[PDB]
Amino acid sequence: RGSHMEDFVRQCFNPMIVELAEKAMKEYGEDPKIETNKFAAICTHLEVCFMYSDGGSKHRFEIIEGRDRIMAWTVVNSICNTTGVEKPKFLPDLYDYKENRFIEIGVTRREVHIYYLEKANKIKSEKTHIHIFSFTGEEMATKADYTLDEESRARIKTRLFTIRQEMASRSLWDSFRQSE
């Protein structure tokens, strides 16, 4: 209890994000007060997922991440039963109504090549689309199709680096980079 990282997360991310991540961790039997680096990780993933869906047009994206597990799979079933898209083996983060594909968004502190490969071999779902951002500003997506416009992904990268600096300025970055 009482880590600097936990107090930083609550001050760095907005309350709706923090509570959704708290719900997510407790749902999977994990404590945000002890596994604080993870706590930071899902908050980052949540905010990136929400900025991503803000980049399309009005009705482009269905948001799967941030739901409770039962309701997330319910919406996936309805998406599949109306688009004819194969049911993904694991929960994705969004659905693209424009390009008719599920999106799995990744945020990694290692180089982009390694995370994508793990995300692809562990997906094995041939149809889903994969998009990785890093805390240094690199990105890679399936078939080099990055879905969104340059400006929308750019502000995602800007926000990721700002998170890194605020962590580093509190001597918390070294611990977070070695957690993954």
Instruction: Name which position in 5, 12, 40, 41 contacts ligand KU4 (CB under 6 A).
Output: 41
**DSSP label at residue 35:** S
Tokens of 35: 């596994």
Residue 107 sits in the site that holds ligand KU4 (CB under 6 A): yes
Q: Would you call 143 a catalytic residue per the annotation?
A: no
Residue 47 sits in the site that holds Mn ion (CB under 5 A): no
Do the annotations mark residue 113 as ligand-binding? no
Instruction: Name which position in 3, 10, 25, 62 contacts ligand KU4 (CB under 6 A).
Output: 25
Residue 65 sits in the site that holds Mn ion (CB under 5 A): yes
Catalytic residue among 38, 87, 119, 157: 119
Contacts (CB under 5 A) with Mn ion, residues 94-113? 105
> Would you list the DSSP string of 107-160?
EESS-HHHHHHHHHHTT--SS-EEEEEETTS-EEEGGG---S-HHHHHHHHHHH
CA 87 distance to own-chain centroid: 20
Q: Which residues are catalytic?
A: 119
